[PDB]
Amino acid sequence: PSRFTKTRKHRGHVSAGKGRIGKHRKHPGGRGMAGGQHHHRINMDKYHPGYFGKVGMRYFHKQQAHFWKPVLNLDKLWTLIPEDKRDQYLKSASKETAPVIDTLAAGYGKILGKGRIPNVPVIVKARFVSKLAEEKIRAAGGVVELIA
Amino acid sequence: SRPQVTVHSLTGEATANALPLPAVFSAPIRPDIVHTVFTSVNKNKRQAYAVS
Amino acid sequence: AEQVAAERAARKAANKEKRAIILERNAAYQKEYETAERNIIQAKRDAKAAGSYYVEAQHKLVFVVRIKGINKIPPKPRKVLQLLRLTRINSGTFVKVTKATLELLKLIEPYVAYGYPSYSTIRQLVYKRGFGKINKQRVPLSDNAIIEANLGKYGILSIDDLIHEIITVGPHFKQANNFLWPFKLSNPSGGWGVPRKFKHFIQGGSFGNREEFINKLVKSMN
Amino acid sequence: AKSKNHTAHNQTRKAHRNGIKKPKTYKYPSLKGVDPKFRRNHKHALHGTAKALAAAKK
Amino acid sequence: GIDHTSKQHKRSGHRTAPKSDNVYLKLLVKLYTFLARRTDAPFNKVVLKALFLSKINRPPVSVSRIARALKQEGAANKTVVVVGTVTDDARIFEFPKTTVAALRFTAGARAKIVKAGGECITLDQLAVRAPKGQNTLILRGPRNSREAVRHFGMGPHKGKAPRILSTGRKFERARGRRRSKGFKV
Amino acid sequence: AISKNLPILKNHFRKHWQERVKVHFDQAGKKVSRRNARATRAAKIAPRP
RNA sequence: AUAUGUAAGAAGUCCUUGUUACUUAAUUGAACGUGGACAUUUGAAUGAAGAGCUUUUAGUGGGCCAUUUUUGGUAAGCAG
RNA sequence: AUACUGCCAGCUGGGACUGAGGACUGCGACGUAAGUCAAGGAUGCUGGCAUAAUGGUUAUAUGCCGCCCGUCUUGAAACACGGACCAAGGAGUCUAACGUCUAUGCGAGUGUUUGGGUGUAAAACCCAUACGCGUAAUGAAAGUGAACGUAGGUUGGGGCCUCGCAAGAGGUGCACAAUCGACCGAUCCUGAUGUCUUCGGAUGGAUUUGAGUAAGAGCAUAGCUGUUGGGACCCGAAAGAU
RNA sequence: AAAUUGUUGAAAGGGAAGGGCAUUUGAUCAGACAUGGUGUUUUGUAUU
């Protein structure tokens, strides 16, 4: 849409919207992040604090495959169970028929107890569990059994 | 809405059979959506040019 | 519903009753003005006969006309002129006389001509140039119906009631004056009477407090 | 090639364009910077007041 | 000349005739302009301006939020009116039997409404069944809970989510953010 | 060079990328050629899967 | 003298001290609050052209000249 | 009586410019009532030509005025710079990654188009996966990981719920704003049952601290404007190297 | 095509020319009176 640009509206005006006193020169302040500590220090300190320096330790050959662990909350777990049977278990909440939820199969490595699952017993299968998640699951009546 | 639509036969004015509307004809008319999508797909059918 | 006979008759009867009460109010106002003027005269004569001096009560109302342009004016006088609604040259406004308003006038002395108007000039200004501030719009008064519709809560039901409040400043003078849009006067028809305007009226100029000559000045300007 | 060093010209006008309007005030100002002993006491007193008010209007 | 106090030829500063080219949105705007003009209902006026509203100013409102609005005392039977999109919340396991009027419904949200037993209606049905907005309750979504607003107003000692691309160690967590490295913000 | 509140960008374009640009105008042609080669190999090994 | 900080109330004024891990010799104070009383003079004037608020970005970052105050200089269409 | 001043909703006269505007309306005035008016904007009557006569254009003449444009500049007509003239060409573009806003689609999801299928063979149409972003944050990290309450209390709040023909209040209050809290990481504390003889910190805290929670709001496409690297709005070095 | 030239010709001319406002003079030109009007003395009264 080059016909909508302000370049078409600046046709006829001398400076093309760049000013007559301070012209549109090539690189009046530097190139890129030039002078972030000298003359752009004000911008860096105002808007990007912590830009300069190093803090943590290094980790040669880091692997996001090692660090893969998506988290799942308890409400998201009860919605992770399929709906057309979710209605059935929610109505017929009882033991000896509690659904088994494989958070690992769903793609979650950890479960977190963000609050207020119904009182339906349910067997939970997760790689890692949280203290509050386990307490809330047991209060609901189910259990969390560890897998790998 | 629209009850039925007849079928035109090559051997006369029409025939006895008629069918209802698939509701794709009842789907909303969005000229702006059609305009944007058509602009984009008409751009999709294109070829590249450049100077030496 | 014809809305030709019954509605018209009811509206015309209400209008006639309102006109009668307006006429009664105007007669009362004229009697009050005449009584006040004659009483002032007899008070002066009685003081002279008794050997004492009758000091005139300081006038409770002034008319102030901004007569200087809108260029090269310092911030404090500019703000005081804006507060008194004097945003154009040859622009007038009625002011109730108090310590605060007198200090404002003393502040804006070199840009306005102000003085003590009489009933004649007040009536002249209201009748000739009377515009209400309705919905932030300058509509001409032109109708006791309009004045009553916009000031009936205060009992002002006609241009005569508005003029009466203005001349005999009362409980609702602030509301009536704010309803009155600032007067846009022309230049004086016979001239300003002085070669140079921007000296004090005392010094042979035109600005400042011309006490009772504001009547002549505003009648020439209106 | 000397130049003008400093001036306050036009500064008040620039301020008063959309300037010196007063800051907005609030009921219940921030309790930061006040004595932390008073803060602890006010916290406990507010908790007790809320409990007593709920008891009064159950 | 006039010594102007305010700025001359200043636009309203508000929105009218929404930027959307949707002919159906224009139809709804026409209907509610007529309603607001000839009804005097503040509900009609506010629904008209909410129709004028833009997208980020019309955040999605969840069925959980509607359920909370109905759990409000004496509001169980009020028609819940939202000018925008109603989304389905998977964090609630119960819904009441309310009537919801809205511009748009997600598939899950509409299914939730009709499974709970209520009706999903549009703004024109809301107008036809309640011209003055009788027994209505207007719902609004959280406008100030997005990435843009969390970045807005960034500066020293504000704590307003610095505009960054990569998040983690050695990405703006250094001099100017801890006392051990120079100063702290 | 730096300006108002914006994310710090790392655009690695300080080499002769304009010489090293590859634009895949031949997506459709490559797909057609791959399907044609699959068909030809199937014909060549006609009973084999 | 001119400039300049405040205040001119409803987020206010008066009986119940209800809570407290603060404070007091002490149900003494402090803070917050529940119950009650105060309308067309809700506590000066004038005005208000709609208050208030957020985002984003341009140009600019050589200035100069009156009237007053004023510095260096004999002075300057000098410099500040 | 009369220099004077003030008032008259006092009485007459002579000039000028203007004539905006609608299918019933308004406000008014005028003899004891028919209706007429100068009352919400010009009508009535009468003349000359049925044309360059009025006018438009144009060239002179006359009265007054009028310095050569662009640029740098506090200041240009400048004794500052470019411009003898004319034709054609001639300078904020495209890309990668993005910020704000807007429109659109779907929505706790979103994106078909790396590929595969089929095709009227670079269109179009269709497709079990994965992946990117979002749904969880915090710490350097090991790690831990978001409801003690109707997802809280107070203040203000648009909107919505009655007695309601003169002045008249409560209830609910979800955008958002201010404040006091609660919860999740980090720091500093405290430390009960139990001991792979020294280990997990249950609980209770702290003028500390986080780009958090506290009934999701994002993803994708496109469009002004703005950012960065690229030749980078166009033209321009003295140079350096092979 | 323009710059730049020669010639139908027209006007101007006391050390520039060009321009604005306003008329005058000369040259040139559009608009407008068969338009939707009289019922019968002129007619080329299904054409009015």
Swiss-Prot record, chain A:
Region listing for Disordered, in residue ranges: 1-38
Biological process annotations from GO: cytoplasmic translation
GO CC terms, sorted: cytoplasm; cytosol; cytosolic large ribosomal subunit; nucleus
Keyword NAD: no
Compositionally biased tracts (Basic residues): 1-13, 20-29
GO MF annotation list: RNA binding; structural constituent of ribosome
Subcellular location: Cytoplasm
Family listed: Belongs to the universal ribosomal protein uL15 family.
Protein name: Large ribosomal subunit protein uL15
Source species: Saccharomyces cerevisiae (strain ATCC 204508 / S288c)
Gene of this entry: RPL28
Swiss-Prot record, chain B:
Residues modified as N-acetylserine: 1
Cell location: Cytoplasm; Nucleus
Family: Belongs to the universal ribosomal protein uL4 family.
Function: Component of the ribosome, a large ribonucleoprotein complex responsible for the synthesis of proteins in the cell. The small ribosomal subunit (SSU) binds messenger RNAs (mRNAs) and translates the encoded message by selecting cognate aminoacyl-transfer RNA (tRNA) molecules. The large subunit (LSU) contains the ribosomal catalytic site termed the peptidyl transferase center (PTC), which catalyzes the formation of peptide bonds, thereby polymerizing the amino acids delivered by tRNAs into a polypeptide chain.
Other comment: There are 2 genes for uL4 in yeast.
Assembly: Component of the large ribosomal subunit (LSU). Mature yeast ribosomes consist of a small (40S) and a large (60S) subunit. The 40S small subunit contains 1 molecule of ribosomal RNA (18S rRNA) and 33 different proteins (encoded by 57 genes). The large 60S subunit contains 3 rRNA molecules (25S, 5.8S and 5S rRNA) and 46 different proteins (encoded by 81 genes). uL4 is associated with the polypeptide exit tunnel. uL4 interacts with its chaperone ACL4 and the nuclear import receptor KAP104.
Name of this chain's protein: Large ribosomal subunit protein uL4A
Organism annotation: Saccharomyces cerevisiae (strain ATCC 204508 / S288c)
Gene symbol of the encoding locus: RPL4A
Residue numbers of the full-length protein present here: 2 to 53 of 362
Curated annotation (Swiss-Prot), chain D:
Keyword Amino-acid biosynthesis part of the UniProt annotation: no
Annotated GO biological process: cytoplasmic translation
UniProt crosslink position (Glycyl lysine isopeptide (Lys-Gly) (interchain with G-Cter in ubiquitin)): 51
Region described as Disordered: 1-36
InterPro entries, per the entry: Ribosomal_eL29 (IPR002673)
Chief place where the protein resides: cytoplasm
Highest taxon of the lineage: Eukaryota
One GO MF term: structural constituent of ribosome
Keyword entries, A-Z: Cytoplasm, Isopeptide bond, Ribonucleoprotein, Ribosomal protein, Ubl conjugation
The UniProt record lists the keyword Heme: no
Gene Ontology CC entries for this record: cytoplasm; cytosol; cytosolic large ribosomal subunit
Biased composition (Basic residues): 1-25
Compartments in which it is found: Cytoplasm
Family: Belongs to the eukaryotic ribosomal protein eL29 family.
Further facts: Present with 51100 molecules/cell in log phase SD medium.
Primary role: Component of the ribosome, a large ribonucleoprotein complex responsible for the synthesis of proteins in the cell. The small ribosomal subunit (SSU) binds messenger RNAs (mRNAs) and translates the encoded message by selecting cognate aminoacyl-transfer RNA (tRNA) molecules. The large subunit (LSU) contains the ribosomal catalytic site termed the peptidyl transferase center (PTC), which catalyzes the formation of peptide bonds, thereby polymerizing the amino acids delivered by tRNAs into a polypeptide chain.
Subunit note: Component of the large ribosomal subunit (LSU). Mature yeast ribosomes consist of a small (40S) and a large (60S) subunit. The 40S small subunit contains 1 molecule of ribosomal RNA (18S rRNA) and 33 different proteins (encoded by 57 genes). The large 60S subunit contains 3 rRNA molecules (25S, 5.8S and 5S rRNA) and 46 different proteins (encoded by 81 genes).
Swiss-Prot record, chain E:
Subcellular localization: Cytoplasm
Gene3D superfamilies named in the record: 3.100.10.10
A GO cellular component entry from the record: cytosol
Organism: Saccharomyces cerevisiae (strain ATCC 204508 / S288c) (Baker's yeast)
Name this protein carries in UniProt: Large ribosomal subunit protein eL18A
Similarity remark: Belongs to the eukaryotic ribosomal protein eL18 family.
Main location: cytoplasm
Keyword Ubl conjugation belongs to the record: yes
